[PDB]
C-alpha cells in the first residue's frame, strides 16, 4: 500500500520473500556453474538462514 508520497509501505513479508528468492537464484546459478564446494556451502548456509 502507498504512503501517499510516491512511496509504498514496507510489508515485511515481501522483504523476507525477496531475500529468499535472491538467495535461491544465486544458489541455482552456482549449481549451474559447478562451483567449488566452499562458496556453494556458504550460499546454502545463508539460504537456510534466510
Amino acid at each position: 500500500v502507498p504512503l501517499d508520497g510516491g512511496r509504498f509501505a514496507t510489508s515485511d513479508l515481501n522483504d523476507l520473500y525477496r531475500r529468499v528468492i535472491n538467495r535461491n537464484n544465486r544458489l541455482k546459478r552456482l549449481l549451474d556453474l559447478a562451483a567449488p564446494d566452499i562458496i556453494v556451502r556458504n550460499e546454502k548456509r545463508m539460504l537456510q538462514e534466510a
Binding site: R26, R29, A35, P36, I39
Partner: protein, 1144 residues
Amino acid sequence: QYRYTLPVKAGEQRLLGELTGAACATLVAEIAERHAGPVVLIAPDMQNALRLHDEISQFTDQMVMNLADWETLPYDSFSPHQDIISSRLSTLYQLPTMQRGVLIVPVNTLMQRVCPHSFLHGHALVMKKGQRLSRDALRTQLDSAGYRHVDQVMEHGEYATRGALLDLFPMGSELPYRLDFFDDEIDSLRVFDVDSQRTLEEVEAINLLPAHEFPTDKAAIELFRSQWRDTFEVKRDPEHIYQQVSKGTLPAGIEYWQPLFFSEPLPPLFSYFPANTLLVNTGDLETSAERFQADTLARFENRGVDPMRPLLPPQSLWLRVDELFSELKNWPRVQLKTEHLPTKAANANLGFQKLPDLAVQAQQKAPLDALRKFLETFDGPVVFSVESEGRREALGELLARIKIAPQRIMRLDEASDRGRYLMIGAAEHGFVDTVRNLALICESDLLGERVARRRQDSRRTINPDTLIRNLAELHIGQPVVHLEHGVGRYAGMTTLEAGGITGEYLMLTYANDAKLYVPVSSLHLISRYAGGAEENAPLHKLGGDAWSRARQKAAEKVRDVAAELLDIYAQRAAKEGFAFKHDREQYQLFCDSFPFETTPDQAQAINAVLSDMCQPLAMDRLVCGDVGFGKTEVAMRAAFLAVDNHKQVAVLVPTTLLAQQHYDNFRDRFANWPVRIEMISRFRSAKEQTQILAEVAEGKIDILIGTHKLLQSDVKFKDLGLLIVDEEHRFGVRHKERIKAMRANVDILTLTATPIPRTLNMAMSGMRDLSIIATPPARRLAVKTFVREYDSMVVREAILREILRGGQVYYLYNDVENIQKAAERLAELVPEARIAIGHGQMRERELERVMNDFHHQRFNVLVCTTIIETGIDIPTANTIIIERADHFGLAQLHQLRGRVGRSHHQAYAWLLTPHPKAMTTDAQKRLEAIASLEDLGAGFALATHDLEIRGAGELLGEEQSGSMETIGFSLYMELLENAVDALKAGREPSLEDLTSQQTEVELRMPSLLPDDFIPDVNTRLSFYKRIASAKTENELEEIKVELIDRFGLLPDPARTLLDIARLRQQAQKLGIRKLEGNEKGGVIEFAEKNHVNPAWLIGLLQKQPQHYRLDGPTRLKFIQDLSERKTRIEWVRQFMRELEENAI
C-alpha cells in the same frame, strides 16, 4: 702468498681490521679457499647473514649454506611451516662431517638448543637396492617416523603406497623417490619429478630423516605428559595444549616445547660442529647475543602469563650468553672488525680502505668525471662486479662514454697488474686493497645518494620598496600582504597560547573578519601593500573556496550510454561469432612446451575456453579466481589457439607494468613458436608507435599487448579475433566497449581476481559465462591475516617479526602529506628498521630508484601508498601492514592481501583498524567479510559478498557497483531481442560504424536526446540512426517535425543534436574533417582536397590574428570567448556559411 695466519687452538683469537663493506666476503672467501676445515661464519644478525649468503658465492665456488631459522620470535605462536624444517635438520645431518665449505649462522640460531644426535641418528635410516624389507613394514616404519600418507605427494614429509608401488619424499634430500616393492623387498630406487611424475633415473641407496625436530609417537607423547605433570600444571580445556596433544594434534606454537619431548637437556649444537672447525665473527657478538637474550626474557615475562599455554624458562630452551661465551672457547675464532686495531700478535690490520667518491651526476656536463679521473690515475687492477647480466649492459655504454671495455673474469685472483675487469655477483660497496692495490667499484658506488628536494624561495626578493624592512612601526589598520594568503588589514600585537606555550602574534583581519595570526618570529612572511592603495586596498578571504566551489553538480549526461551499450550488445547478438579450428597434436605441442602440469580446475577452465572458443558463438567468459592461481596460462593457451588461425589476439591490461609483464612472459613462452608480439604504452616513443600501428594495420603483428593506448581510436586491426582483458576491475565501462565497438563479434575473454558487482551480476544472470578457478598448482601456502585495533606494540612486534626473519615489510599509509611524518614516527617506534618512503607523487625516477633499492634489500620497511597495488613483487617482502583498513575497497584489500607471498615463506597481512565505534557500518561489514572467509580460493567469495553490499549498477549503462533502481533483467532481454529484430530486418548499418562516416563535431555540450523527453530507449536509438544517416537539411527538419508530432517540443540538447547534424552535412560537403569549439575557442581541420579559400584565410588571419591562427595548412585555432553555446553555434554557423561562398 698469504697475508695472515690461520689459528688452530682451543679459544684463541685472530683480529683482522681496517675492513669495510663487501671485503669481509673476500676475506672469508680466501679463508674457505685456504683452510682445511669447515668454516662457520656467525653473523651478528640474520638480516646481515642473508646478505652474506649472496656475496660469498660471488667470491668463491666453495659450497655454502645457511642454517634455516624458524621465522617466528622466541615464544611466538606459529609453527615454522615445516618446509623450513626440511631444510634445517638436513644441515644437521651433514654438520657432523663436512671437510670444507662454509655455513652461515646468525646468533639467534647459534644459541638455540637443538635435538640430540640420539633422536636424529636413531630415526634416520637407509634404503638400498637389496634389502629384504617388507612393504607395509616400511610403511609402518614411515608411520613411526611420523610422515604423512597422501596420494598426491608434492611437498616434504609426504608418502604414498599403492599395492606394490611406493613413493616418499625424504626430509633430508630434495627430490622424491619411488620404490616398487616386490616379494616384500625393495627393487627400485627411482627418482621421479614433482612435475613430470616420471622416473628421471635410478639410484642404488638413499637416506631418510624423520618427521621433524622432535619425536611424535605415543611413547614420546606419554613422556611429554609425564614431564608436563612434573614441571607445569594441567587444566582441562580443549585449547590447553596439554590435553590438546593428549588428543594427538600438535598445536601452533609447539616448537617452543622442545625440551619436554626429549627427557634430556638439549645440546647447544656445538657438539654438531666437527672437531677441527674454525669460527669467524662479524661485528660484535657480546652486544647482539645479549640484546637477543634480553628480548627473549622481556617477551617471556610478557607471555609468562595466560596459564592456558604457559611457557618454559629460557635457561633450558635457549643458551645464556655467559654459557655461549664460555663454550666458544673450544673453537678458534677470527674476528673481522671494521675498525683500526692498534697492534699485537694474532692481530693483523689489512689495508682494505675506502674508495674515493666516484659519484656520477648529469648536472655537470661530464657525468663520469670522478670515474674517468680515478681510473686513469690508478695504478692497479679495477673490477666492477655488476649484479645482473642485463645490468652489465648498463656498464657497457656508460664505460663507453670514456671508452672503457673491461674483461670478464670469474675469480678475483684473475686480476692482473693493471686493467679493467667485470664479473657477476651481489656485492654492494667497493674498496681498495693496498697490499695488491685492487679496486672494487660496485653498482651502488656510482648511484650513491638518494635526493629529495623540489623548490624554494620564488618571490623572496626581500629588498623591494614594498617589504617595509620589517620596521614594526606601522600604525594599526594599514593594509598588509601575506605571501601565502593575501591582502588584509593589520590589527596589532596579540598574545595567544598554542598548547601550553605563550606567544605574540600579528592580528590580520581579512574579509568577513576571519582573523589570521602569524608569529613575530616569522615577520619575513609580511610585506607592505605594493599597489600604493593603502586607503583603497581589497580584502581577500583566507585560503579561498576550497569546498564551496564544489557545490556545482549536474553537467547533464554529456552523452547518454543507455542508448549506446544497447546498440553494442545488439551488434553482438545479431551477428554470429567466428569459427576457430583446434588441431589435437598441433595444439598439444603447445601444451607440451608448457613446462608444468595443470590442476583439475585449470583443466576445467581450459576445456570450457577451448570448447566455447572453437564454436561459432561469441565468447563472453570470466576466469575469476584468486591471485597466484595460474589464470594467465589459460589466456595464453587461448591466444595460441587464436594465433593458429592468424586472428590477431589483443591483450589489454590496466597498467604499463602489467603490460611489460605480459609482454616478456608471452615473448619468452612463444620464443620457440614463430610469432611476433609487442607491448604498447607511453613507454614506447611516438617514433616507434607510428611504426607499430602501421605494422598492425598490414597485419604483421599477431599479438599486441598494451594499456589504454589501444582504445584511443587509432589502432586499426586488420582482423581482430580475441580480446583478452586482464584485471577487469580498474577498467571502467566503455573502456571494455571502445574495443568491442570496432568489431561486433569479438570473442571476449576477461580474466580477473575480484569482479566488480555489475560484471559479477551480469555473469550470474547467464549473460556472461563464468568459470571459477581454485586449487592452486603448487601447494601454495595461504597468507594469514589479522584484524586488530591499531596498537603501537602489535605493529612493532609484526615489524620485528618480519625483519629478524629477513624480509621486507609493506607499510601501507595511503597518504602523501602525512607519510613524510609517518616515516620518522615509525623510525622512532622501531629503531631496528631501515625505513624509506615511496609514493605516487615522487618524481617517477626516485620512485624506480626506491623500487630497485627494494629488490636488493638495501632497506627493510617501505612506508608506501597504494602504488604497490600494481606490485613489482620481490621474494623477501612478506608482511603487509595496512595502517587504515577502515576505508579501502574490499577488492583492493583482497588484492593487496595477495601481493605478499610468492615463496615458501609464510606471509602475514595485518589489517589495522581504528576503534570499532569509529569506523562506518560499511567499513564494519567489509571487515568481517575479509576476516571470516579466509582460506584458499577466497577471491570469488569476496566479490560475491561485495555484491549485495554495494549492489549491481545499472545494467545498460556505465557506473558499475551501484544500488540504483534502474531497468530490470526481464526488460533488458526484451530490449535486446527487439533491437536484434529491428537490426536484422531492414538494411540498417551499425551506429559506431557510421561514426566512420561521421566528422568530429565536438563542442563539449549536452547534445543528445534526453531520457525524460523520450522514455523508451529503442525509439531513441532509432532516432539516433535516422538523424545520423540523413543527408539533407529538409530531411533533418522532417525528422524535427516528426519529433513535434510524436513527442512535441524539443529540449535544448535535442535541437543541438539536430543542428550539429546540420553542421555535419555541409561540413562533409566542405571536407571539414574535424572541428572542435569550446568556451574560449577551438580548432577546425579540413580535408586536403578542400575548398578553403587561400585569399579568404589570409584575409581572416591578417585582420584578426588574436582570434584566428593557422598552425598548418588546414588546422585553424580560433580563440573566441564563446561563453554561451548559443553564441558558439551562431559563430560557427555564420563562419562556415561565409566559408561556402569562399568555397571554390
